[PDB]
């Protein structure tokens, strides 16, 4: 066949490759709508009511 | 109110400053004189302060608790002639002093309590630190486990109260009422141990007989009335459950009363025949109290303040044989009408006082609470009649044998009657009478 004996390693390369299945899984992200919300830094935060709202106000 | 409680402060330096016995006694006198002129109040509660008021219940309390305070220094010298760390003694009363008017004057009942509680400490150090006699051990331990081990767990029921609540000002409860048959037993039972109870009469005479003339006064004077001022404040919201339950304790009362006063005439102790006689009358404050009817409180307040006025000259004149004839019993105290028979005319008045002779403050209080318990129950009465009558009974023979027998064979000179104590009993005495005058603001509250 006049064929050549590939290299020491030919097959030891990487295979990049031409796709023929053409079937990539799709990349997705979870979305859980109802996770637990805490306080954003934006929400304002008025000065404190009714002093410490202990017992006497102390 | 803060007035008073800022001079309070800024007299508790005199303590550290050498030979202020009398310069602190004449401004405690002087405070009380102010605290005099500071009167206008109603049934509501008035002179607001940060958390501190003032109203015809708290305002007679805290005259009486500032008008005391100066008369322990009147009552004891013997410090002084000892030199047994008179600092100590000054920070001790003024101590006491500030925590009394914060008691009295806290409209939350969680600040009531707080300071109604933190007076454990300074009464312990007042007998401990100048007692007498070797039980003044065990007695302080009877004194402070008693009380804390019931007054500790109304701290739950304050707790419980804000929860379902959501405050603990007085005005507030009132609006509401509560009857879990838990909350008044916790609270209840706690008070009635201080107030005392005839059943938990016990550590009383204990901590009266071996503490110092000082530390009996406010026993006697202050911690048993600072108890029954909780109740009168904190029944408002008890009504339901204690209709339910009150048969008990009007009982327990009345029968221990005729007990208690037998008790006194087999007694033998001047500071136990006073002990006795003041679980007696407290027996009766309780019972009217309980009753819970207009004429009863109104009436218990009044007698709560007469009581702790007589109670204390009794004890300046209990302290008076005491520092005599060294020995409190009646056997070796007797015939003193033949070496201080001026004194002796105090021993009859502050008697005269304690059996509800007129014109007495005590005396307007026990038509007061006997109205109300006679109306509760007509079967009252055939305990009622006993109850006065041993009362004057024993009051009769504390007067007669100590004063009036032969002298005593042995018996070592000592000095005469003098003015600290002349003073002493009138001061005790004369507002005792005076206050029949204005009785309107000590007899009117609710
Ligand atoms: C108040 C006051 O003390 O002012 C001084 C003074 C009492 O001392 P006092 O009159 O000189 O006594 C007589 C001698 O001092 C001498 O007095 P004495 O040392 O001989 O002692 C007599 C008596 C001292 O008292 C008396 O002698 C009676 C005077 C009223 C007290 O005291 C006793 O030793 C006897 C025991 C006390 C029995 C209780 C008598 C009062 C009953 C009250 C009924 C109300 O009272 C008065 O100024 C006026 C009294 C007159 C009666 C008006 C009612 C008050």
């Given at each position: 066949?006049?064929?050549?004996?590939?290299?020491?390693?030919?097959?030891?390369?990487?295979?990049?490759?031409?796709?023929?299945?053409?079937?990539?899984?799709?990349?997705?992200?979870?979305?859980?709508?109802?996770?637990?919300?805490?306080?954003?830094?934006?929400?304002?935060?008025?000065?404190?009511?009714?002093?410490?709202?202990?017992?006497?106000?102390? | 109110?803060?007035?008073?409680?800022?001079?309070?402060?800024?007299?508790?330096?005199?303590?550290?400053?050498?030979?202020?016995?009398?310069?602190?006694?004449?401004?405690?006198?002087?405070?009380?004189?102010?605290?005099?002129?500071?009167?206008?109040?109603?049934?509501?509660?008035?002179?607001?302060?940060?958390?501190?008021?003032?109203?015809?219940?708290?305002?007679?309390?805290?005259?009486?608790?500032?008008?005391?305070?100066?008369?322990?220094?009147?009552?004891?010298?013997?410090?002084?002639?000892?030199?047994?760390?008179?600092?100590?003694?000054?920070?001790?009363?003024?101590?006491?002093?500030?925590?009394?008017?914060?008691?009295?004057?806290?409209?939350?009942?969680?600040?009531?309590?707080?300071?109604?509680?933190?007076?454990?400490?300074?009464?312990?150090?007042?007998?401990?630190?100048?007692?007498?006699?070797?039980?003044?051990?065990?007695?302080?331990?009877?004194?402070?486990?008693?009380?804390?081990?019931?007054?500790?767990?109304?701290?739950?029921?304050?707790?419980?109260?804000?929860?379902?609540?959501?405050?603990?000002?007085?005005?507030?409860?009132?609006?509401?009422?509560?009857?879990?048959?838990?909350?008044?037993?916790?609270?209840?039972?706690?008070?009635?141990?201080?107030?005392?109870?005839?059943?938990?009469?016990?550590?009383?005479?204990?901590?009266?007989?071996?503490?110092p003339v000082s530390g009996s006064m406010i026993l006697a004077g202050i911690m048993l009335k600072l108890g029954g001022y909780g109740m009168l404040r904190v029944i408002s919201f008890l009504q339901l459950m204690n209709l339910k339950y009150?048969?008990?304790?009007?009982?327990?009362?009345?029968?221990?009363?005729?007990?208690?006063?037998?008790?006194?005439?087999?007694?033998?102790?001047?500071?136990?025949?006073?002990?006795?006689?003041?679980?007696?009358?407290?027996?009766?404050?309780?019972?009217?109290?309980?009753?819970?009817?207009?004429?009863?409180?109104?009436?218990?307040?009044?007698?709560?303040?007469?009581?702790?006025?007589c109670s204390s000259g009794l004890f300046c004149l209990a302290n008076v044989s005491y520092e005599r004839l060294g020995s409190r019993s009646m056997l070796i105290n007797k015939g003193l009408l033949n070496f201080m028979p001026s004194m002796?005319?105090?021993?009859?008045?502050?008697?005269?006082?304690?059996?509800?002779?007129?014109?007495?403050?005590?005396?307007?209080?026990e038509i007061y609470l006997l109205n109300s318990i006679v109306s509760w129950s007509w079967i009252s009465m055939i305990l009622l009649s006993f109850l006065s009558f041993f009362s004057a009974a024993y009051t009769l023979y504390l007067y007669?044998?100590?004063?009036?027998?032969?002298?005593?064979?042995?018996?070592?000179?000592?000095?005469?009657?003098?003015?600290?104590?002349?003073?002493?009993?009138?001061?005790?005495?004369?507002?005792?009478?005076?206050?029949?005058?204005?009785?309107?603001?000590?007899?009117?509250?609710?």
């Amino acid at each position: 066949f006049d064929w050549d004996r590939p290299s020491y390693g030919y097959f030891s390369r990487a295979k990049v490759i031409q796709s023929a299945r053409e079937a990539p899984k799709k990349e997705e992200k979870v979305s859980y709508p109802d996770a637990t919300p805490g306080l954003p830094e934006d929400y304002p935060k008025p000065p404190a009511k009714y002093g410490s709202r202990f017992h006497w106000l102390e | 109110m803060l007035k008073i409680i800022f001079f309070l402060l800024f007299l508790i330096p005199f303590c550290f400053i050498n030979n202020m016995y009398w310069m602190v006694q004449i401004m405690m006198f002087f405070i009380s004189f102010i605290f005099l002129l500071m009167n206008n109040f109603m049934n509501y509660w008035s002179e607001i302060s940060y958390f501190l008021g003032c109203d015809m219940l708290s305002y007679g309390l805290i005259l009486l608790s500032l008008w005391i305070c100066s008369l322990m220094l009147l009552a004891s010298e013997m410090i002084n002639k000892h030199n047994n760390y008179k600092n100590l003694f000054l920070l001790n009363i003024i101590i006491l002093l500030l925590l009394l008017i914060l008691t009295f004057s806290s409209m939350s009942l969680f600040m009531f309590y707080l300071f109604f509680e933190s007076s454990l400490i300074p009464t312990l150090f007042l007998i401990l630190g100048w007692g007498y006699q070797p039980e003044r051990l065990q007695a302080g331990l009877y004194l402070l486990f008693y009380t804390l081990l019931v007054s500790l767990p109304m701290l739950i029921g304050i707790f419980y109260l804000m929860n379902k609540i959501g405050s603990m000002n007085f005005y507030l409860m009132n609006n509401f009422m509560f009857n879990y048959d838990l909350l008044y037993f916790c609270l209840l039972c706690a008070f009635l141990v201080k107030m005392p109870m005839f059943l938990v009469h016990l550590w009383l005479p204990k901590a009266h007989v071996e503490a110092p003339v000082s530390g009996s006064m406010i026993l006697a004077g202050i911690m048993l009335k600072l108890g029954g001022y909780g109740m009168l404040r904190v029944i408002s919201f008890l009504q339901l459950m204690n209709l339910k339950y009150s048969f008990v304790w009007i009982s327990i009362s009345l029968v221990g009363g005729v007990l208690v006063s037998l008790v006194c005439l087999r007694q033998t102790d001047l500071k136990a025949l006073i002990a006795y006689s003041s679980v007696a009358h407290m027996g009766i404050v309780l019972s009217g109290l309980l009753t819970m009817t207009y004429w009863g409180l109104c009436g218990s307040y009044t007698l709560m303040i007469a009581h702790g006025l007589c109670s204390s000259g009794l004890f300046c004149l209990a302290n008076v044989s005491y520092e005599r004839l060294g020995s409190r019993s009646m056997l070796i105290n007797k015939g003193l009408l033949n070496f201080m028979p001026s004194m002796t005319l105090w021993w009859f008045l502050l008697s005269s006082a304690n059996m509800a002779a007129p014109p007495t403050l005590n005396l307007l209080g026990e038509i007061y609470l006997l109205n109300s318990i006679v109306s509760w129950s007509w079967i009252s009465m055939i305990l009622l009649s006993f109850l006065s009558f041993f009362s004057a009974a024993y009051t009769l023979y504390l007067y007669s044998f100590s004063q009036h027998g032969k002298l005593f064979s042995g018996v070592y000179s000592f000095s005469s009657g003098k003015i600290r104590e002349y003073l002493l009993m009138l001061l005790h005495w004369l507002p005792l009478n005076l206050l029949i005058l204005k009785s309107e603001s000590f007899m009117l509250w609710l």
